[PDB]
Amino acid sequence: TLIELMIVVAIIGILAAIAIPQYQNYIAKSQVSRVMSETGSLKTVIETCILDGKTAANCELGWTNSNLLG
Amino acid sequence: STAAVTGQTGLTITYPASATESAAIQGTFGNSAAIKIKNQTLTWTRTPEGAWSCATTVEAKFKPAGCAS
Numbered sequence: 555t556l557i558e559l560m561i562v563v564a565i566i567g568i569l570a571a572i573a574i575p576q577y578q579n580y581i582a583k584s585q586v587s588r589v590m591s592e593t594g595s596l597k598t599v600i601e602t603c604i605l606d607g608k609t610a611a612n613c614e615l616g617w618t619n620s621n622l623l624g
Numbered sequence: 625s626t627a628a629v630t631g632q633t634g635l636t637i638t639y640p641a642s643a644t645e646s647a648a649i650q651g652t653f654g655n656s657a658a659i660k661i662k663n664q665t666l667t668w669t670r671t672p673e674g675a676w677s678c679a680t681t682v683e684a685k686f687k688p689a690g691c692a693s
Binding site for chain 2: 606607614
């Protein structure tokens with residue numbers, strides 16, 4: 555019957571109009587936290603170099619490239 | 625364990641038999657050491673005048689400030 559198909563169309567329209575949360579916040583926060591951890595890992599080597607009296611060129615960083623450029 | 629015959633194969637003692645030669649305590653890494661430094665050596669050498677110093681054959685980034693020479 556026509557009314558059943560119209561109800562199906564209405565249900566499809568209702569489902570398609572679901573509110574989408576701003577998922578950008580979660581991804582951005584996770585990426586910033588990952589960069590936070592990655593950059594804070596270098597604090598140990600930087601502090602040891604500074605307290606050892608080494609120059610900038612003599613401080614060996616164990617840095618590996620990060621895909622976030624952080 | 626004596627200077628002539630130590631109890632470990634990784635430790636060697638070069639003892640001066642005269643007044644003009646230097647003494648040495650050499651240790652080669654291994655066993656539980658990292659694979660990267662598996663066969664390097666660290667030596668403490670003593671000149672005939674009685675001055676001690678340290679040398680190491682590992683890479684510079686692994687050298688402590690004491691044996692940077």
